[PDB]
């Protein structure tokens, strides 16, 4: 009923753990926060900002219409201030 | 005192079945939670309440309850003084502290059992005399409560009557229906379409009157139980244990939970469409009204207008011949309402009154109720599932009905659960089949 690993109960209870994780856990949190709040995420995944779905006048959708020249076609969609 | 060697943790409260003292603490602390909510919620509602705005458009379910009792409202359900709402809220919230005190006290300080610290309050589940007696006490307490309503209506102010002659207004009932033939007649009424059983009550005279009967009958039975014991059959029929008594009251609440669901959904009287929303049928009736009113103004002869099916665009007949509204609204021809009745004749909707007695207040009433049908989403988006976000609304009639059906059902489950256990607890196999004496093994093979 036991294996090599240190029983979770002990670790989650150890002061050493929290001394570590009071630093580590919030760190990742603030990092992920910055990832969005700095708008970096928008660029990593090409996700449109609230002001970047259409052009001002245009009401059409930037649908990719051919596989091989898709990447080029996409870039052209960003051109019209979209 | 009590731990794993009694019940499991997740069945903790069952360790108090035989601890009268602590079991009283629970009930007194619990009753505080009910008073606390009622109080704290009323103030929550009031704090958001907007006077010059319909109550049903504000997510209120407690302030409209006070309104019905003739408090802070006037002509047409107009909100006059919000002070009574504030009072009812704060007084409760205070009383919750008093009850909570005793609750906490009896559960962690006071006697863990009562039998010795006072033989009057101490009790035995199998003591058919004490049980019928304690039952007799509450049967009176509830009885006086029933008369507390009668008092408010006949003496201390009245109730909100939507059926008011001059139009919906607070009215003092000074003529309660006391005729037993009429009162108890409701109980002999069908529960289907038309004959609506208890929910079919349509005037405050019966409401007040009926409560007089209940009030007296309840106390009468309250005294009866104090001075008696269960008979012969009464003892050879029921199961006498702490759980059994619980089960009996569980199924009881379940039944009342279902009755309450239909009441808030159908009844127009004790649930005013001015404070709550318009009832389901009421809303569908209003649309037929609205467009009968419109198109007629465009020069259409509603009486002879032929719909796609050739049935009657605006007006048709009920299966018994009465003139009713047309369309899918043919199912709600049982609807009765203050705004609609003046158009009704001896044979149903009169074509002449319809033709020239339509009042403006009725037109905008129809439009209002039409545009406030009890249709909405969980995230509170008023309308059909295909509607667009804009109108944040869900009829209080919808909230109450759904919530209390869920509760009523689960309580029916709780009933079966606790009734099934009590029967097995009594006979004594609620913990498994006796390995040695296995009953089935003593019965002939049917094969």
């Amino acid at each position: 009923g036991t294996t090599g690993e240190r029983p979770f109960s002990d670790i989650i209870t150890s002061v050493r753990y929290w001394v570590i994780h009071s630093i580590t856990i919030p760190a990742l949190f603030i990092a992920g926060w910055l990832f969005v709040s700095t708008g970096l995420a928008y660029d990593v995944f090409g996700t449109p900002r609230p002001d970047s779905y259409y052009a001002q006048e245009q009401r059409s959708i930037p649908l990719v219409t051919d596989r091989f020249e898709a990447k080029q076609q996409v870039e052209t969609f960003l051109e019209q201030l979209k | 005192d009590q731990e794993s060697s009694g019940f499991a943790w997740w069945a903790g409260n069952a360790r108090l079945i035989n601890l009268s003292g602590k079991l009283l603490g629970a009930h007194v602390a619990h009753a505080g939670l009910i008073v606390f909510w009622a109080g704290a919620m009323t103030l929550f509602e009031l704090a958001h309440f907007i006077p010059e705005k319909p109550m049903y458009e504000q997510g209120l379910i407690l302030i409209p309850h006070i309104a019905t009792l003739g408090w802070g409202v006037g002509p047409g359900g107009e909100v006059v003084d919000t002070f009574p709402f504030f009072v009812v809220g704060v007084v409760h919230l205070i009383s919750s502290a008093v009850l909570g005190f005793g609750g906490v006290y009896h559960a962690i300080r006071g006697p863990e059992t009562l039998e010795e610290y006072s033989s009057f309050f101490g009790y035995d589940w199998k003591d058919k005399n004490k049980m019928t007696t304690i039952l007799g006490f509450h049967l009176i307490v509830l009885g006086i409560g029933a008369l507390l309503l009668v008092a408010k209506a006949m003496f201390f102010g009245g109730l909100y009557d939507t059926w008011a002659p001059g139009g919906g207004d607070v009215r003092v009932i000074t003529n309660p229906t006391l005729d037993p033939r009429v009162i108890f007649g409701y109980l002999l009424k069908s529960p289907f379409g038309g004959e609506g059983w208890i929910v079919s009550v349509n005037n405050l005279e019966d409401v007040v009157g009926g409560h007089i009967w209940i009030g007296l009958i309840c106390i009468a039975g309250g005294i009866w139980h104090i001075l008696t014991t269960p008979f012969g059959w009464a003892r050879r029929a029921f199961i006498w244990s702490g759980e059994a008594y619980l089960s009996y009251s569980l199924g009881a609440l379940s039944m009342m939970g279902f009755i309450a669901t239909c009441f808030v959904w159908f009844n127009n009287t004790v649930y005013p469409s001015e404070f709550y929303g318009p009832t389901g049928p009421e809303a569908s009736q209003a649309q037929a009204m609205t467009f009968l009113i419109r198109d007629q103004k465009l020069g259409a002869n509603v009486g002879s207008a032929q719909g796609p099916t050739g049935l009657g665009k605006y007006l048709m007949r009920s299966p018994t011949g009465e003139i009713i509204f047309g369309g899918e609204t043919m199912r709600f021809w049982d609807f009765r309402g203050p705004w609609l009745e003046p158009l009704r004749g001896p044979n149903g909707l009169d074509l002449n009154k319809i033709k020239n007695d339509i009042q403006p207040w009725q037109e905008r009433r129809a439009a209002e109720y039409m545009t406030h049908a009890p249709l909405g989403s969980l995230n509170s988006v008023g309308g059909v599932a295909t509607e667009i976000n804009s109108v944040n609304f869900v009829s209080p009639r919808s909230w109450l009905a759904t919530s209390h059906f869920v509760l009523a059902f689960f309580f029916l489950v709780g009933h079966l659960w606790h009734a099934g256990r009590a029967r097995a607890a009594a006979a004594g196999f609620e913990k498994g089949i006796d390995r040695e004496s296995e009953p089935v093994l003593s019965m002939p093979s049917l094969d």
Partner: protein, 137 residues
């Protein structure tokens, strides 16, 4: 793709003169539109009379013209039929009937202008959606 002041420029009166609303007014109008209109006029239609919508073109062919701040504001005080040959404030929310339509009691002239602006701005944004019904949802 944003709510520019270029978009928030709507006709003030019949004589071509225009007015430019602010993002504060728009939001305020939109909110007030939900408070007192959405009930029957959700998404530019009219539940209790689908024949007449809040399309700018429809308001233009109204009598008097209701396709401007001034038209709409007047309507919200003394509403009429499409030909204007009949006042309908008794069966329609308005200032002169606030006793009958309590929602209209709070409403002040600022609110009226905000609401008016909203009706003229939405079709600039939504387009055919604002006028049509379920077809365009």
């Amino acid at each position: 793709a944003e709510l520019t002041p270029e978009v928030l420029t709507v006709p003030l009166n019949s004589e071509g003169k225009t007015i430019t609303l602010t993002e504060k007014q728009y939001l305020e109008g939109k909110r007030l539109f939900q408070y007192a209109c959405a009930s029957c006029h959700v998404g530019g239609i009219t539940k209790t009379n689908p024949s007449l919508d809040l399309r700018t073109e429809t308001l233009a062919l109204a009598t008097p013209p209701r396709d401007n701040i001034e038209g709409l504001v007047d309507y919200m005080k003394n509403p009429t039929t499409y030909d204007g040959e009949q006042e309908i404030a008794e069966v329609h929310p308005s200032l002169r009937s606030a006793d009958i339509f309590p929602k209209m009691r709070n409403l002040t002239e600022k609110d009226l202008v905000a609401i008016a602006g909203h009706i003229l701005v939405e079709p600039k944004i939504l387009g055919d959606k604002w006028g049509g019904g379920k077809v365009y949802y």
